[PDB]
């Protein structure tokens, strides 16, 4: 039954990412004055399916072992990185899972650098080196902010987190920390306004958008949600899914609106605006439970 659990996880990742692409394209269309796409079939579903098919039948051409090894790592992260996400009963009860999130984000940085090395000595690989540098400049911020938002939760176990979110949401004790972390999720997804940047393009594209859905599900679990009532977990599943959907639409909706940074403005902004503010909010979150006598039950 355990391989059946694995198949019920990683068969809807294909449908999830493909229908995510139609959802984001339709949503951008209605953000503008566009009905795109609706002509190709009933409300545009066979258009992403058959378009994925056409992308698989492109017949491209060509170091070969490196070109093999990069997108296989990207998509095996995209598969193996929905394991401890506690849609009510998670797949593996990891004692620590958030540090596993950080480690596999670093593996995504490996993937980008291997693709840039496989790109065979190009001004594109210099740009991809810069993209590796900007992507690696974010796991400091994400780990430190994640450390502070678990500090009010005691353990790394994330079931304790779903215990903590019953009374009020955790968005209220840490809202600006959450704001900086959500900007870091925009940062880690390598999309707008944080840009730029051959095949197999379907597998690489799949890796990026499964990484997006992972970051949005983890955002939804980390800060808000509903209550885990046993012997009817589907209620929590539905409410969690609705909130994660609204957050992902908001995520693409913020992508729909602003021009993208300058690279040096991005570094300048990152260090000289997030990084002291992270440290200051984090030391305040350290000294907070000793001044409220509320340290969480680290069991």
């Amino acid at each position: 039954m355990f391989m059946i659990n694995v198949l019920t996880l990683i068969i809807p990742i294909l449908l999830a990412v493909a229908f995510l692409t139609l959802v984001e394209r339709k949503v951008l269309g209605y953000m503008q004055f566009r009905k795109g796409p609706n002509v190709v079939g009933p409300y545009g579903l066979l258009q992403p399916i058959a378009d994925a098919i056409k992308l698989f039948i492109k017949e491209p051409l060509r170091s070969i072992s490196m070109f093999i090894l990069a997108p296989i790592l990207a998509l095996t992260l995209a598969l193996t990185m929905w394991i401890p996400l506690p849609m009510p009963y998670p797949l593996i009860n990891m004692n620590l899972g958030v540090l596993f999130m950080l480690a596999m984000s670093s593996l995504a940085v490996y993937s980008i650098l291997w693709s840039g090395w496989a790109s065979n000595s190009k001004y594109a690989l210099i740009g991809a080196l810069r993209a590796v540098a900007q992507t690696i400049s974010y796991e400091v911020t994400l780990a430190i902010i994640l450390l502070s938002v678990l500090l009010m939760n005691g353990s790394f176990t994330l079931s304790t987190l779903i215990i903590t979110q019953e009374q009020v949401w955790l968005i209220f004790p840490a809202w600006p920390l959450a704001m900086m972390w959500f900007i870091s999720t925009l940062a880690e997804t390598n999309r707008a306004p944080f840009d730029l940047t051959a095949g197999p393009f379907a597998l690489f594209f799949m890796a990026e958008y499964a990484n997006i859905i992972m970051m949005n599900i983890f955002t939804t679990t980390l800060f808000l949600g509903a209550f885990h009532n046993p012997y009817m977990p589907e209620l929590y599943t539905i409410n969690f899914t609705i909130k994660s959907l609204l957050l992902s639409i908001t995520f693409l909706w913020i992508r729909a609106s602003y021009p993208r940074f300058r690279y040096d403005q991005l570094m300048h902004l990152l260090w000289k605006n997030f990084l002291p503010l992270t440290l200051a909010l984090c030391m305040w979150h350290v000294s907070l439970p000793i001044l409220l006598s509320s340290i969480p039950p680290q069991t």
């Binding site: 002291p276 440290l279 200051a280 030391m283 305040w284 000793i290």
Partner: protein
């Protein structure tokens, strides 16, 4: 002054200074120490009777020893 120059720096040093100084004012750090000391993990060991102590209550129901009552009274 510097409030327009680097305002996030000013707010950062402000919350940092209160995070440093602010543990000097608390009626709650003693509560933190009592909570984090009086949580049993290991086994509460027994010991030999004949030290003739006017303490160390022989019954766990017996409140003759030092215990907690401010817990349930918040």
């Amino acid at each position: 002054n510097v409030w327009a120059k680097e305002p996030v720096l000013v707010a950062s040093f402000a919350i940092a200074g209160l995070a440093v100084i602010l543990p000097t004012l608390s009626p709650y750090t003693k509560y933190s120490l009592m909570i984090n000391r009086a949580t049993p993990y290991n086994y509460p060991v027994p010991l030999r009777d004949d030290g003739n102590m006017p303490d160390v209550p022989s019954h766990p129901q017996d409140p003759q020893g030092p215990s907690l009552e401010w817990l349930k009274r918040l």
